[PDB]
Design a protein around this ligand. Structure first.
Ligand SMILES: [Zn+2]
Lengths: 215, 259, 221, 289, 290, 239, 464
RNA sequence: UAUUAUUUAUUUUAAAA
RNA sequence: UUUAAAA
């Protein structure tokens, strides 16, 4: 069976009953179904993130006559910290607008590339009470890893960083911006946001090449 | 209609030139003529209809519900329905997720202006119906929810905690600062405001910028306008576009709050 | 004793109705017919197995019921002599004859017997014959019983569905098509009911052969 | 600046026959469009004016799409590359068909065997391409059959596309005209217009094969003043269409000069300036001649 | 994947109609002979009229009422069609025109028109109510799908019995069917559907068309009456335009059919009740004195 | 509202009208010229309907092409704000829409000369902005007026009217409150004739009472055709 | 303030009002049609017969009001009577008196307020109109639908202020409309504030007098002056409060036994006293049914009463109430309750009395009864709230919602109570089963066995 | 290369000699 | 919260 009894209610936990550095771990090539795999994990402060990205492509589309390729990115919930399906597809369209400027589309006529990102675990350990902004940079680094493992041509590496809900994705060692995302945050601040994300971008730009050149 | 690759290269070279040769030839800060109707749905607390220049049309309805904010999180919900598209389409769920961020209770919209008792408040239901669309309609919808929220009337409250009661005839006007959303298209090194249908097809990238309380507010996006010519932009173009809306947004609010 | 009829439905190639205790299953077969693009097989015959419950819509319970019924009929059909063709086997459960929320073996066993009879009425090339019986063992007195009633299932430790393949006059058990077992049992009880089931299916085909012969013989010349 | 027309309160601001009514009871008539025969009597199927020409009785409806006829210099866009033909978007009820043996092929004929007929066509005439052709003949359903069997018809480039209603196209001897400012207009009778820079052919042929015409390569160097001239032409043409004025050669150059008052073409999109330029031509020409 | 009708077959059936001939031998106003068969469990009914065979299955469960009507029970009906009734049907096509129209007509006839006593299905207002479900299985399609389905559902609802309930203050206990005998549902009136098929060579109308006549049809009309001279529901959309005189003739002809079919269901239920209550003469508690 | 008099002895209904008086009928043509080929803003009482006809055009996919006639597709979109209480989408509410859409397609495919337009499709997009009873009849009037605007050839008008029967008194053009208190019949009358293209009876009506209700139904529908016809006369002469 | 002209004399406006229900708001819009063919229904009128229209049965409206009304002393003389809501609800019995009122005008806004506050009174008022003849004549003038008398609402105006003003505008129009025929219009209202506002309206002076003033002016005043007519339950205590109350000798436990001939007097037997403790009144019974296990709290000796000496059941008590009453007095009940008050004052049998503060076990079950014909709309197929008169006289009336009230009329049905909160005056039940027609031998016996939990079903099949 | 073509056929001018 | 007997 599935779903279960409709009269059952989910468990409720009460808040009144008993009471710098951003770690990173990268892997690639471990899913036999797809061409390129990736597994990024990050645990800073009271928020741990671990997601898996798989790339199935390039797939020759029957009867298609397109000049360049078509990228399909899809975010999918995992097992902890479930987000609404509308916001997941919003980040998907934002991500597709990024890799369409990075992936060599002209090198894949009459074919498409399907991306699958699984937010398998998004732990959060805040003491007492958009949260999706802290995962967009980690998702961009995961797709670029799986796209590189799948033998797909990527014009330069792509990374991003968070600066209080502000997510900026850079390219060419931060020379040009390929994506901009900002939820909540404050006003006037912009120069420090582009600076804190750029140094975080270079931290991810070289760490991705580390695991990609080993193994 | 679609565009041939012959005329696509004709517009790119004319728009990216240092004198931006727009198709209709307007200035990079001029908008197209707009018709806005308001107060035509009696069953709704507020309503508006907007007709763009390219035949694009959007209808907004505003309903209200008495809810306990101690148990109801978001006090403002946006429900978009584009004609000819499914409700689970990507082009619909993205705008639905984006419009609920520009109109988030406590962020772009202050939850204090629609509160009632210490226990209860009003929940605003903003329903969008896109009859016709040629480009990204997130900016056209934001104008429609602006004129509708600035013409919305909610029932007046009549006031030990008991359930609230309202007067029979007299109603209060909903005074809320409604955020505004603008679309910017970058073609090479030129920043364009309010891109047309054919203009947004040759653009290198796009910019979405919110505007509330007379200033730029969250959220802001950089979504593409066409998967063909997606080009990365220099950060000075992002600053130029983010500063160009500051120069012409009050001209919009003045021309939009007259009703 | 079981009841069975043949050729009951008009607008299909072959139909049947199998009854056991209170379980009633009407099955229909249509083929070979034009398959869909997502169904055609280049070298052999394609099967479309559909079982529908007596109450409510078709849930995932009938999906595993299709997958088991498919594993029995597929080796029982000479698929290769119908290349690029389709066979539609649809089983309609009229009465479950058992607690649907707890057991599903009495319906699986009847769908197998109804599908086989309907395949005979349709004229599909069958490699052999088939029989299916439900088997259960009682908790207090660990006794093996064949074709248990609905009340005996609610007092059983394990339930079993045995589907055999018969050749040469219905005496030689060529293979064991399906043996689905759930509950509590060990190796000694398995071969005890497997030996007991082989002789209860052996008299089922002997009775099935009599049923289909009493109907097909008046048709032919 | 924005011009936002605001309204509040409501949702918005010869013989005439209606479908179902009797137009005549005389059996001696030849029923045409908007007209159906029933019980030796004649009824209307649309809402419009009754027309009588010799013995052809018909009803001309108000709103109607472009009805293609034999010998029409139209401008259409390629929709799909089909089996031994093309589907070109003319603007009628159906797509017009452009057969393979009705165009000027690059190498004269197909170079076979290697690929199919359809795949070889996409090399020079893909989907979405814009061109002009002449309606060679009509099918029974009214579909148009185009042909590009002359140097005059070809693949359009070096310009911009605009669309006007088909009914607002005044009939004339010439389909395309040369305009002041080194610009050439292609007034398609189906409502499709192509404003481009004057080329070597249309300038040297209207005044007194090879795959060079199927090339998508635009002109390398176009004057910045010529492109801005095309915008003003596009704005005044769409202005005359907003004022339900028939588009002729003189009315295009008349609005082009009358639009000098407004300097840059940024303020040519408003409805007040459109109705003014349209009224300036309808009065200073029809009441003066 | 559809049925092919030859030109000669279409011309022969139509010309036979112009000569008052139906291939099966019925009149133009003659309904097919209906045959009701009851299963073991309550609410198990199989209807056979001609070569058309339909099987119904009634069930019920505790459910949450509608907040608009906290004192009424729910009624669910599903009329999916499997390839068993003919390979022209696709399995899983739940949104088909035949499936939707059949469900809506029986739903209006049973639930909306008050045939089923939904107020008697109320257990606890605004929380607990009976949701009587009707499953319809199209076994063999020879036309008259909604006509046979309406007889199957109405026979099943009158044959179905729900578990018993005792009111004990604020507590409510559902007796198991093994302890106390289940209680029958409340059936106010009995609506029966009659479908009319129209042709034109002066129009011809036949009652309860077969599958072959149904394909050569130019217009369809469905009426639903009860023995109380009430028009439960009427559905006519498109086809040959008809006037009020032709409809009233259809309704008066259908009333002669639904009246006889009503008496048959009442008689066949009485016969089935006695078959399964052989020793009911000894178990009578309320008895007469002397 | 509250407990009201349906039909007073003074012959007055709950909204002030009389037994044979229609609600206010304000129709409009060519309301969406840059978004469809046919437009009709139907405002019948409190009912507000937007009907858009897109065609005849080439089908997007050849899987829906008829070589002898056009295909008619009717899409009815009932907005969440059509009533007082903002209704949430229900799985059961989708079945009633399909029955209405099919009834509309079968109704107008017989009256619209689809043979004149072969290898084409005609999409009818409908948006119901507000409903207050008699919604089925008002949907018919919007389609008829929108098809005429698109120049689609038809045999005659199709007029939609709703009639209710209270005790022994029939009432024309029932509103939402009246439908909740009586049986309702919707009719689809063809032109000035007494021929019906649609007849929906969704509640119990005595057989002896149905004959008279139809007569008054087809009569009041002729009045609806006049109101639609006059709107086309004024819109054609002023343009 | 919108209005649009339509056909000949027909116009329509938009009626908008907000409805508060269960702490929620709902903006309601309705069509309001204003017409100019509504007759005054006066036989003297020679301007309205020319504008009338026949009904659905093609029948012209008969003009009812007499041409020679009752002539009083100057300056009244010949006059018609116009009533307000208060007089109709208060002196409905005086209106039915054949020697009192003769020609009376009941405006629409008054009839709607009476039906909303008492359906059985509204029915008896419509009966006066329908049964008009030579000695009695009542009409209903649809003033809210007439273009001449309908009045728009002023800003920040009370809902009752507008309706009071609508009654004035009705009389002002009737006064002017009948000037040619020399007939005055006497407005009978007990609202002194409304009459004073009529004197300030000099633009159309009308005659306004109270009920006692109008009666004294009649020629037969000496014969009819003797017939002039002149809530929330306390919440149940908390479970912790009833624990300490029973512990510390403040509260007591017992079973209520409603008296045999009075459904408003109950006695609870306690081991402390020899005589059962009386519970008199609706507030003291506090939504209790005969047989419940309740928690009682003794009242001071200042409130101790004697055993009642009057007969009362739910059917003969508050007969003019609507079932849906939540958070209109009869003269017969006034003369009955005040009569029993004199007995409990001069009696020696005054025993201790208590009040219910907590229900411990509800004795609810399936009760048998019939619908009250006073609350049934015989021609309505809509959901309507009706009363149920149970067979057990010791029980009150039960309010149920049903759409088959007309069909269930004169039937003997079965119901079961769902809830009874502090805000509702009557308990809320629901229909479960119909047993048959009233006084049917088959139905009355089955209704008898159900009322005593007698198992009349056949024996089990396991008995075989 | 429409007197050409589509194979489980999207052709929508197969008529004349 | 109607004693007793036979029903
Ligand atoms: Zn008068």
């Amino acid at each position: 069976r599935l779903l279960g009894p409709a009269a059952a209610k989910p468990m409720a936990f009460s808040n009144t009953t008993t009471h710098s550095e951003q770690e990173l771990s990268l892997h690639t090539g471990f899913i036999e179904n797809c061409n390129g795999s990736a597994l990024v994990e990050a645990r800073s402060l009271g928020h741990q993130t671990s997601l898996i990205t798989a790339v199935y492509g390039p797939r020759s589309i029957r009867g298609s006559f397109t000049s360049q390729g078509t990228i399909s990115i899809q975010l999918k919930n995992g097992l902890l910290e479930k987000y609404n399906t509308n916001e997941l597809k919003e980040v998907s369209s934002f991500l597709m607008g990024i890799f369409n400027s990075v992936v060599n589309l002209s090198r894949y006529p009459k074919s498409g590339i399907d991306i699958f990102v699984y937010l398998t675990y998004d732990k959060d350990l805040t003491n007492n009470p958009s949260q999706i902004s802290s995962l967009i940079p980690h998702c961009i680094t995961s797709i670029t890893l799986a796209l590189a493992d799948a033998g797909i041509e990527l014009v330069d590496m792509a990374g991003a960083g968070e600066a209080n809900g502000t997510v900026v994705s850079f390219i060419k060692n931060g020379e040009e911006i390929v994506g901009f995302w900002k939820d909540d945050g404050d006003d006037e601040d912009l120069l420090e946001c582009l600076d804190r994300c750029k140094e975080q971008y270079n931290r991810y730009r070289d760490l991705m090449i580390s695991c990609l050149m080993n193994q | 209609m679609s565009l041939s690759v012959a005329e696509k290269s004709y517009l790119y070279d004319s728009l990216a030139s240092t004198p931006s040769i727009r198709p209709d030839g307007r200035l990079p800060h001029q908008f197209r003529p707009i018709e806005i109707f308001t107060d035509f749905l009696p069953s709704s607390n507020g309503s508006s209809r907007i007709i763009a220049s390219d035949g694009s049309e959007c209808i907004v309805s505003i309903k209200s519900k008495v809810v306990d904010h101690h148990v109801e999180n978001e006090l403002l919900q946006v429900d978009v329905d584009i004609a000819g598209q499914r409700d689970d389409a990507l082009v619909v769920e993205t705008i639905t997720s984006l419009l609920n961020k520009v109109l988030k209770s406590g962020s772009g919209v202050d939850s204090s202006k629609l509160q009632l008792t210490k226990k209860y408040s009003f929940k605003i239901f903003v329903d969008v119906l896109v009859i016709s669309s040629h480009s990204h309609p997130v900016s056209l919808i934001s104008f429609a929810i602006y004129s509708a929220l600035n013409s919305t009337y909610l029932p007046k409250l009549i006031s030990v905690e008991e359930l609230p009661t309202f007067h029979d005839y007299d109603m209060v006007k909903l005074d809320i600062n409604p955020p505004l959303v603008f679309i910017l298209a970058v073609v090479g090194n030129n920043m364009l405001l309010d891109p047309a249908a054919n203009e947004s097809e040759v653009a290198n990238n796009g910019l979405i910028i919110s505007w509330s309380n007379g200033k730029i507010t969250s959220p802001i996006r950089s979504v593409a306008l066409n998967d063909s010519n997606v080009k990365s932009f220099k950060p000075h173009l992002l600053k130029q576009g983010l500063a160009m809306v500051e120069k012409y947004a009050p001209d919009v609010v003045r021309s939009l709050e007259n009703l | 004793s079981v009841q069975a009829e043949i050729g009951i439905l008009d607008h299909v190639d072959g139909s049947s109705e199998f009854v056991s205790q209170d379980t009633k299953v009407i099955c229909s077969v249509t083929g070979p017919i034009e398959p869909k693009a997502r169904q055609e097989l280049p070298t052999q015959l394609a099967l479309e197995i559909i079982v529908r419950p007596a109450k409510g819509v078709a849930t995932t319970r009938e999906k595993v019921l299709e997958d088991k019924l498919r594993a029995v009929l597929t080796p029982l059909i000479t698929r290769h002599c119908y290349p690029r063709q389709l066979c539609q086997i649809t089983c309609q459960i009229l009465e479950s004859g058992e607690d649907e929320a707890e057991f599903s073996l009495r319906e699986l066993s009847c769908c197998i017997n109804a599908a086989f009879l309907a395949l005979v009425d349709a004229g599909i090339a069958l490699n052999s014959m088939c029989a299916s019986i439900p088997i259960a063992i009682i908790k207090d007195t660990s006794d093996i019983i064949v074709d248990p009633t609905a009340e005996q299932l609610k007092i059983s430790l394990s339930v079993h569905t045995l589907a055999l393949e018969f050749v040469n006059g219905g005496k030689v058990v060529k293979n064991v098509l399906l043996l689905d077992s759930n509950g509590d049992f060990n190796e000694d009880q398995l071969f005890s009911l497997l030996e007991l089931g082989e002789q209860k299916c052996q008299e089922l085909v002997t009775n099935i052969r009599r049923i289909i012969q009493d109907n097909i013989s008046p048709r032919l010349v | 600046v924005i011009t936002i027309t605001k309204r509040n309160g409501a949702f918005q601001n010869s013989q005439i026959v209606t479908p179902g009514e009797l137009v005549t009871d005389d059996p001696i008539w030849m029923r045409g469009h908007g007209t159906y025969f029933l019980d030796n009597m004649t009824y209307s199927s649309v809402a419009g004016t009754v027309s009588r020409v010799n013995r052809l009785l018909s009803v001309i409806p108000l709103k109607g799409r472009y009805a293609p006829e034999t010998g029409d210099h139209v401008v259409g866009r390629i929709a799909e590359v089909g089996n031994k033909r093309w589907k070109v978007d003319i603007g009628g009820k159906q797509h017009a068909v452009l057969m393979l043996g009705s165009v000027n092929l690059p190498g004269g004929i197909l170079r076979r065997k290697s690929e199919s007929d359809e795949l070889q066509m996409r090399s020079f005439l893909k989907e979405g391409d814009l061109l002009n052709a002449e309606v060679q003949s009509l099918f029974q359903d009214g579909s148009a059959s185009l042909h590009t069997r002359s140097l005059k018809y070809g693949k359009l480039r070096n310009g911009m596309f605009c669309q006007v209603p088909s009914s607002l196209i005044v009939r004339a001897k010439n389909h395309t005209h040369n305009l002041p400012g080194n610009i050439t207009v292609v007034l398609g009778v189906n409502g499709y217009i192509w404003l481009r820079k004057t080329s070597q052919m249309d300038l040297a042929r209207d005044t007194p094969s090879s795959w060079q015409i199927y090339s998508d390569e635009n002109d390398p160097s176009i004057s910045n003043n010529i492109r801005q001239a095309i915008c003003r032409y596009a704005n005044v043409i769409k202005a005359l269409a907003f004022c339900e004025i028939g588009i002729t050669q003189q009315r295009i150059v008349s609005a082009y000069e009358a639009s000098m008052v407004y300097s840059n073409v940024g303020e040519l999109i408003e409805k007040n300036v459109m109705e003014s330029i349209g009224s300036d031509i309808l009065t200073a020409e029809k009441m003066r001649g | 994947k559809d049925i092919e009708i030859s030109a000669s077959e279409s011309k022969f059936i139509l010309e036979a109609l112009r000569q008052n001939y139906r291939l099966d031998g019925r009149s133009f106003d003659q309904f097919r002979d209906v045959e009701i068969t009851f299963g073991k469990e309550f609410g198990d009914v199989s209807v056979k009229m001609g070569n058309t065979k339909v099987h119904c299955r009634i069930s019920c469960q505790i459910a949450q009422p509608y907040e608009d009507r906290p004192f009424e029970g729910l009624f669910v009906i599903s009329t999916e069609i499997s390839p068993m009734a003919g390979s022209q049907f696709e399995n899983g096509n739940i949104t088909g025109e035949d499936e939707v129209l059949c469900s809506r007509i029986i739903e209006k006839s049973v639930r909306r028109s008050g045939a089923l006593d939904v107020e008697g299905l109320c257990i606890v207002a605004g929380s607990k109510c009976w949701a009587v479900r009707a499953d319809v299985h199209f076994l063999d399609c020879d036309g008259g799908f909604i006509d046979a389905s309406c007889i199957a559902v109405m026979a099943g609802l009158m044959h179905f019995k729900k578990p018993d309930i005792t009111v004990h203050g604020e507590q409510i206990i559902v007796h198991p069917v093994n302890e106390r005998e289940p209680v029958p549902l409340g059936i106010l009136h009995i609506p029966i559907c009659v479908t009319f098929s129209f042709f034109n060579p002066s129009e011809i109308s036949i009652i309860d068309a077969t599958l072959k006549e149904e394909l050569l049809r130019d217009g369809v009309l469905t009426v639903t009456l009860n023995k109380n001279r009430e028009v439960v529901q009427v559905s006519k959309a498109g086809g040959l335009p008809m006037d009020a005189l032709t409809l009233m003739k259809c309704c008066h002809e259908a009333y002669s059919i639904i009246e006889k079919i009503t008496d048959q269901i009442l008689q066949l239920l009485k016969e089935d009740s006695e078959k399964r209550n052989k020793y009911a003469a000894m178990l009578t508690s309320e008895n007469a004195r002397e | 509202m509250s407990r009201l008099e349906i039909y007073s002895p003074e012959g007055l209904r709950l909204d002030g009208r009389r037994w044979n008086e229609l609600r206010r009928f304000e129709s409009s043509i060519n309301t969406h010229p840059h978004a469809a080929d046919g437009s009709s803003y139907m405002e019948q009482g409190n009912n507000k309907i937007i009907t858009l006809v897109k065609g005849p055009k080439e089908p997007r996919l050849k899987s829906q092409m008829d070589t002898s006639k056009a295909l008619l597709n009717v899409s009815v979109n009932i907005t969440k704000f059509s009533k007082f209480e903002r209704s949430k989408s229900s799985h059961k509410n989708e079945r009633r829409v399909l029955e209405i859409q099919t009834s509309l397609v079968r109704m107008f495919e017989k009256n619209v000369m689809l043979n004149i337009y072969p290898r084409t499709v005609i999409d009818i997009e409908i948006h119901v902005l507000e409903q207050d009873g008699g919604i089925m009849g008002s949907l018919i009037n919007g389609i008829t007026l929108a098809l005429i605007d698109a120049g689609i050839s038809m045999f005659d008008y199709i007029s939609g009217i709703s009639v209710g029967l209270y005790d022994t008194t029939p009432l024309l053009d029932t509103n939402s409150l009246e439908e909740n208190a009586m049986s309702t019949v919707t009719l689809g009358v063809v032109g000035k004739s007494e021929k019906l293209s649609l007849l929906l009876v969704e509640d119990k009506i005595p057989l002896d009472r149905l004959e008279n209700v139809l007569a008054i139904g087809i009569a009041g529908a002729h009045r609806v055709r006049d109101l639609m016809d006059e709107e086309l006369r004024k819109h054609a002469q002023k343009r | 303030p919108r209005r649009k002209r339509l056909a000949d004399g027909l116009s329509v406006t938009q009626k908008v009002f907000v409805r508060s229900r269960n702490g929620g708001a709902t903006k309601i819009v309705r069509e309001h049609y204003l017409r100019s063919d509504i007759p005054c229904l006066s036989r003297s009128c020679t301007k309205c017969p020319q504008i009338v229209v026949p009904d659905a049965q093609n029948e012209l409206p008969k003009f009812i009001l007499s041409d020679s009304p009752l002539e009083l002393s100057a300056p009244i003389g010949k006059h018609y009577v116009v009533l307000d809501t208060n007089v109709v609800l208060q002196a409905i019995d005086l209106l039915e008196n054949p020697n009192c009122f003769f020609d009376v005008i009941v405006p629409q806004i008054v009839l709607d307020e009476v039906r909303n506050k008492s359906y059985p009174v509204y029915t008896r008022l419509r009966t006066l109109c329908r049964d008009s003849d030579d000695h009695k004549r009542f009409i209903v003038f649809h003033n809210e639908f007439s273009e001449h008398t309908f009045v728009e609402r002023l800003p920040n105006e009370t809902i009752n202020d507008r309706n009071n003003r609508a009654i004035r505008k009705t009389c002002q129009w009737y006064s002017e409309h009948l000037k040619p025929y020399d007939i005055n219009v006497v407005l009978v209202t007990n609202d002194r504030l409304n009459r004073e506002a009529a004197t300030k309206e000099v633009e159309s002076n009308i005659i306004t007098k109270s009920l006692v003033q109008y009666i004294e002016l009649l020629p037969n005043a000496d014969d009819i002056r003797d017939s002039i007519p002149q809530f929330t339950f306390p919440e149940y205590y908390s479970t912790a409060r009833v624990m300490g109350g029973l512990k510390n000798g403040v509260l007591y436990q017992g079973n209520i036994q409603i008296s045999e001939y009075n459904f408003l007097e109950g006695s609870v037997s306690l081991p402390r006293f020899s005589k059962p403790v009386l519970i008199v009144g609706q507030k003291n019974l506090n939504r209790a049914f005969n047989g419940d296990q309740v928690i009682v709290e003794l009242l001071p000796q200042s409130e101790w009463k004697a055993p009642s000496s009057i007969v009362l059941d739910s059917e003969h008590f508050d007969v003019n109430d609507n079932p849906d009453i939540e958070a209109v007095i009869s003269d017969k009940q006034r003369r009955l309750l005040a009569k029993d008050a004199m007995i409990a004052q001069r009696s020696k049998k005054i025993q201790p009395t208590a009040k219910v503060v907590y229900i411990q076990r509800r004795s609810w079950r399936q009760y048998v009864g019939q619908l009250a014909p006073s609350s049934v709309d015989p021609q309505s197929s809509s959901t309507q709230n009706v009363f149920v008169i149970l067979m057990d006289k010791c029980l009150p009336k039960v309010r149920i919602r049903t759409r088959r009230a007309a069909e269930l009329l004169d039937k003997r049905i079965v119901i079961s109570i769902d809830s009874w909160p502090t805000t509702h005056k009557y308990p809320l039940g629901h229909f479960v089963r119909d047993l048959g027609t009233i006084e049917s031998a088959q139905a009355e016996t089955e209704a008898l066995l159900l009322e005593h939990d007698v198992e009349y079903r056949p024996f089990s099949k396991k008995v075989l």
